[PDB]
Write a protein that binds this ligand. Sequence first.
Ligand code: NA
Ligand code: NA
Lengths: 80, 80
Amino acid sequence: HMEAVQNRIVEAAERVPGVRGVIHLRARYVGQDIWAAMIIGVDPENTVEQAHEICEAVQAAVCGKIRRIESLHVSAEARE
Amino acid sequence: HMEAVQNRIVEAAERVPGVRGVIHLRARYVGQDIWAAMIIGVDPENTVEQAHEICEAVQAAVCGKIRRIESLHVSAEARE
Ligand code: NA
Ligand code: NA
């Protein structure tokens, strides 16, 4: 149930160009809404600006696909 | 007093190669120790790996100069 929604979140994020895994996801219910914080992996050789753009793209993809999410903060860390 | 130490933290961070301001600093006392979390600005065209290296350098500089700090998490965001 909560796991079903967390699966959907990860899957959604992973389908965005430049995402190299979901490193961390904390989702919590505030009433019927989800508030969440995500850390994604990205190519270490992407620029900081590119990584920002991927994060923004993840936020839009995830928010667009999972209607119950009302807050989502995405940050990036180097992976592989 | 608490402000004096926060000033020292910011000053220390700002003297590290690649730091473009301190965007955020939250420092709190746990007993006599400081636990802190910092966000620094960096060149948007630095790579994610470079930004990681600057963060690590800030952690070392700040920890080295302010002995009461016992925990310090540094992250980076694009600035100017
Ligand atoms: Na890439
Ligand atoms: Na630079």
